[PDB]
Amino acid sequence: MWMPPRPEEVARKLRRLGFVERMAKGGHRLYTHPDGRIVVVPFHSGELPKGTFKRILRDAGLTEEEFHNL
Ligand SMILES: [Cl-]
Numbered sequence: 651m652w653m654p655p656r657p658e659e660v661a662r663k664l665r666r667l668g669f670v671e672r673m674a675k676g677g678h679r680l681y682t683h684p685d686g687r688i689v690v691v692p693f694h695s696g697e698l699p700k701g702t703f704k705r706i707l708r709d710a711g712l713t714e715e716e717f718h719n720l
Contacts, residue, residue: 654697660706661691663720669710687711 661671661679669681669689677694689709692702707717 652700654700655703656696657691657693657698660698660703661693663717664689664691664710666720667710683710 661681664681664683665671667683669683669687671679672682673680678690678692681689681691683689687710689706691706692698698706707714710717
């Protein structure tokens with residue numbers, strides 16, 4: 651089963667990989683990693699739509715596995 655992740659849990663996992671928050675405005679935050687990945691995450695809702703979660707994984711350069719273990 652598809653379990654919609656919470657945006658703040660996604661942000662904690664990104665931060666554990668070395669992404670750092672560079673903008674916070676309008677209920678969104680933009681995170682960059684030293685290797686140049688750039689990821690925007692919406693926080694206005696408590697859970698992310700599937701497509702937004704899959705956009706975040708794409709832009710973060712992650713698989714589901716790596717994601718869940720952080
Ligand atoms: Cl980990």
